[PDB]
Amino acid sequence: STGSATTTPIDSLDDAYITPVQIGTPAQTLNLDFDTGSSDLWVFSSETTASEVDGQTIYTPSKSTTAKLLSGATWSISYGDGSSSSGDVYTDTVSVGGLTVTGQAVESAKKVSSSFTEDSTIDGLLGLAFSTLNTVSPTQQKTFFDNAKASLDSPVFTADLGYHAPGTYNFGFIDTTAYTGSITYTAVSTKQGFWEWTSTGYAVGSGTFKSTSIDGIADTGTTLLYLPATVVSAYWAQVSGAKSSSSVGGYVFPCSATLPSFTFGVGSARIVIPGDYIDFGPISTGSSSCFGGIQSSAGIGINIFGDVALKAAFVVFNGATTPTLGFASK
Ligand SMILES: NCc1ccc(C(F)(F)F)cc1
Numbered sequence: 001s002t003g004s005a006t007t008t009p010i011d012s013l014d015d016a017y018i019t020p021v022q023i024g025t026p027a028q029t030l031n032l033d034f035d036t037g038s039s040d041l042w043v044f045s046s047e048t049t050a051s052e053v054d055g056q057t058i059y060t061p062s063k064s065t066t067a068k069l070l071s072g073a074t075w076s077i078s079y080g081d082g083s084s085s086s087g088d089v090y091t092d093t094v095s096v097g098g099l100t101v102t103g104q105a106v107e108s109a110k111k112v113s114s115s116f117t118e119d120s121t122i123d124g125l126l127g128l129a130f131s132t133l134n135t136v137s138p139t140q141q142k143t144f145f146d147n148a149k150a151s152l153d154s155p156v157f158t159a160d161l162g163y164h165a166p167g168t169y170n171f172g173f174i175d176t177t178a179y180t181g182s183i184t185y186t187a188v189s190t191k192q193g194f195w196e197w198t199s200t201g202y203a204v205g206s207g208t209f210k211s212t213s214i215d216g217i218a219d220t221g222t223t224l225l226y227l228p229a230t231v232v233s234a235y236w237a238q239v240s241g242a243k244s245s246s247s248v249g250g251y252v253f254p255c256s257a258t259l260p261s262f263t264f265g266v267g268s269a270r271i272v273i274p275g276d277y278i279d280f281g282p283i284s285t286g287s288s289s290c291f292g293g294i295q296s297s298a299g300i301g302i303n304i305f306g307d308v309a310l311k312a313a314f315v316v317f318n319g320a321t322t323p324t325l326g327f328a329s330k
Contacts, residue, residue, distance in 0.1 A: 001098075043059040088110065133194075
C-alpha cells in the first residue's frame with residue numbers, strides 16, 4: 001500500500017508545515033507537523049489543560065470507538081529549542097493520505113509549553129526519526145513509519161517541501177515525476193536515532209566549492225539551516241552589512257540586501273539553495289533588519305539540515321535495513 005498527503009506552510013515565512021492526519025473512528029482530522037527529528041506522535045487532546053489550548057483542534061479519545069488507553073504509559077519530551085510536552089498514551093487507528101495503521105500509539109498531551117500554545121495552526125507532531133528516540137515509558141512505542149513499514153510497497157517516504165507553496169509527503173513509493181536528474185543516495189548513521197548523514201562540502205554564491213565533511217541530520221521539524229560557525233561566518237561575510245546580533249540571537253542583515261545562494265554537497269552531487277530561501281523577513285514589524293536563514297550550530301551541539309535546505313530538494317528517506325538518504329534537484 002501507499003499514502004500521499006499535501007503539506008502546507010503555516011505562514012508566509014515557511015516557519016513550519018502542517019499535514020492533515022485522520023485519527024480514530026470515526027475520523028478526527030488534525031493538522032500535524034511532520035518531524036523527522038523526533039519520534040513521538042503527540043496531539044492536543046481533551047485532556048490538555050484548558051488554559052494551554054488556544055485555537056488548536058483537539059483529539060477526543062472518548063469519541064473514538066477504536067481508541068484504547070495504554071494502561072500505565074506516560075511520555076515526556078523536550079526539544080532542542082526548549083519546547084516540551086507530556087501526557088498519557090492511547091492506541092488508535094491513524095491514517096495519512098490513505099495509508100492506514102491500526103494500533104498506533106497516540107500520545108495525548110496533558111501539558112504543553114507556551115511555544116506550542118501560541119502556535120494555533122499546529123495540532124501536534126508526527127515523529128519520523130527512528131523509534132529508539134520514542135519517549136513512552138515504561139514500554140517504548142514505534143513510529144507511524146515503523147508500524148507501516150511492512151505494508152508499504154517500498155520501505156521509503158519522501159519529502160517534497162514547497163517554497164511559499166504547498167508540498168507533498170509520500171509513503172511507500174518514489175514519484176519519478178517530482179524531481180529532475182537522478183537521485184544521489186548517501187549513507188545514514190542511526191547511532192543517535194536521527195537521519196544523520198555527512199555532507200561533502202559547501203559553496204557560497206559562485207565561489208569555489210570547499211570539500212569538507214559536515215555531519216548533520218535531515219530534520220523536517222526544524223525551520224532553519226544550522227551549520228558550523230566557520231561555514232556560517234563565510235556565508236554572511238558576502239552580505240554587505242550583515243552581523244551576528246546577541247540581542248536577536250543570530251545573524252541579521254539589511255533587508256535591502258540580495259542574498260547569495262548556498263550550495264551543499266551530497267556525494268558528488270550539489271544541491272543549490274536560492275538566496276531568496278535564506279530571507280526570513282524583518283526581526284520586528286517595520287524593522288529594516290532581516291533575520292537570516294543560515295545560523296551557527298555552536299550552541300546547539302549538532303548540525304541541522306532544516307527546512308531551508310530540504311525544501312530546495314526532493315528528499316528520499318529510505319528505511320531499508322541499511323537506511324540511506326536520497327537527494328535530487330527539482
Ligand atoms: N523540531 C521539533 C519542534 C517542532 C515545532 C516546534 C514549534 F515551533 F511548533 F513550537 C517546536 C519544536
